[PDB]
Amino acid sequence: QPWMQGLIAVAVFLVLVAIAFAVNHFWC
Amino acid sequence: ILVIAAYFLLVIGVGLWSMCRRSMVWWPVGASLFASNIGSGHFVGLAGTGAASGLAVAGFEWNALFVVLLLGWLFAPVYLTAGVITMPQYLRKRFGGRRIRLYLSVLSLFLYIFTKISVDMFSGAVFIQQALGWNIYASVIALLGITMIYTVTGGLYTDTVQTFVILGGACILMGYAFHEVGGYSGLFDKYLGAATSLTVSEDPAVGNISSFCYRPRPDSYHLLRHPVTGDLPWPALLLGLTIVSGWYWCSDQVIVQRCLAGKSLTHIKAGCILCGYLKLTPMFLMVMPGMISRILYPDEVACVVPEVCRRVCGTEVGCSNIAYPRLVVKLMPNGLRGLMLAVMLAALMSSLASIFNSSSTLFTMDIYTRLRPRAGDRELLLVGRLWVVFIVVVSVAWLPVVQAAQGGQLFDYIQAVSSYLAPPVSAVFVLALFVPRVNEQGAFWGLIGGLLMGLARLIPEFSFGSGSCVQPSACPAFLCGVHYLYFAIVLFFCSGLLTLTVSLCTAPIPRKHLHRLVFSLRHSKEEREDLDEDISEDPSWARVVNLNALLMMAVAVFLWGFYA
Ligand SMILES: CO[C@H]1O[C@H](CO)[C@@H](O)[C@H](O)[C@H]1O
């Protein structure tokens, strides 16, 4: 099922972006 | 012929009217970027490698997406704040000395001769060869004549119409191809049976074909391949091609020249977003039509026997690259096939116009002023035109090398050549932009060492040659087995290490010469030492572009995951 793995990729990329913005707002 | 004649009349009229009679909005900038990148070379290469390998090649274009936003978010502020017209001028300002600037300009020019112009000329040549049934060299001559006519008349608003025409033509082609095969599920349910019925090879050199690569690859559907077993491994994609695309977008003169004309930083960012969204599209619009051509015409595309391949294309290793031209020759209706060739010529013309302008602003400005500090404007324009003519003839002369390389397919040749010489420039630019410690000679020696190692690994490639399963190339496995993107990563890392080693062991550069020329000091209000703009964005538009960039990244990652 391509759609489920695409959604998983979206979720992991969203977590990555959230972490990146969190460290950006923490370390300025 | 009527459609082609009408399009030529439109081009001549537009050029004549333009001849007779820095604040660009986001959409014209994005269209200019897309038209500068996308050309006949991209279509031919993607279709050919999709016919040969599969969708993995399309993952290259999708990796050109991410870097663009970096280009729009990391290196564009430095380029605008430094007031650098070109890329070598930036390193002239930051490092100093006329040796690094001159050499980097020359290396960029060579990367142009065997990465941009030659491939586009060969792609137009194969288009005319498939459509008009001519010889390859005669097709090159015809393409040279028509491109000279186009440059004389058309020359340079136009970006938007060029992109719209290209996208419309490609969308029409994919629409008529998917129903020809039966749809997306039609292509995916019948691709693996595209094996040809001709595996004889009457020449006693190989006899019966090994029956290993005439069939489509078992992992052709998957976008991500095995790290060592599969061709185009995912380490060689995600890390291998980011380095090359850094040079392509964030460091090459073509993209920055087409990008420095934005109205402001926000407009540049929005244009980058539009270019990335348009970069989602060319996967569906190129790689899948190549599989269409493979399915409908397997014997004429997936040939492996040297005799039939020489009959079809003139090359015994290739003929996978005629996937796209043949497709528009037969699949499209009889009344059509003029609009498709018009679209292909439009993409080629946009790419060549951008390349010619960038080569002129590189050689005519950097080298000529370094040699002739003061000259007339007419002399400068004449130098630019002569440089364009010379660069075109040099690429035409280099085209026979492009004819047969990297297994007979063109886009793999582009990736291989660009994986050998770009990573030095990528490492030098990254170190200059993010490492203040680097000096002029610290970067120069690392750059020249990277060039030497790249040339040492590159000379066997066009010396021994390349071949398919029928006749594999005779070269050591140690110096050939490693993928060109793996070698790109390794050379990038060793060049970075060499540059850092030379810099930390030699006299540094004072900070007073390093204002607004480094990403860590974009907002510094102090004065510069003159070793030889004014970016701003209101919060509302900045946050709007930030959120739409996040959404665009989400879409790109979704399509990455969806195709494994
Ligand atoms: C010629 O352009 C092609 O190859 C370069 C690397 O050379 C990629 O960055 C780009 O996405 C692709 O379209």
Numbering used by the authors:
A (entry chain B): 28 to 55
B (entry chain A): 26 to 46, 60 to 194, 199 to 574, 641 to 672
Sentences from the paper on this structure:
The uptake of glucose against its concentration gradient is mediated by the sodium-dependent glucose cotransporters (SGLT). SGLT1 (SLC5A1) and SGLT2 (SLC5A2) are two important subtypes of this family, and their physiological functions are well-documented. Pioneering structural work on the bacterial homolog vSGLT from Vibrio parahaemolyticus revealed that SGLT proteins have 14 transmembrane helices, which assemble into a LeuT-like fold.
Subsequent single particle analysis generated reconstruction of the hSGLT2-AMG complex at 3.33 Å resolution. We observed that AMG is bound in an occluded substrate-binding site and we modeled the AMG into the density according to the structures of the vSGLT-galactose complex and the hSGLT2-empagliflozin complex. MAP17 is an essential subunit for the glucose uptake activity of hSGLT2 but not hSGLT115. In agreement with this, we found similar structural changes of the Na2 and Na3 sites in hSGLT2, even though the Na3 site of hSGLT2 is not functional, indicating the Na3 site likely enhances the sodium and sugar affinity thermodynamically.
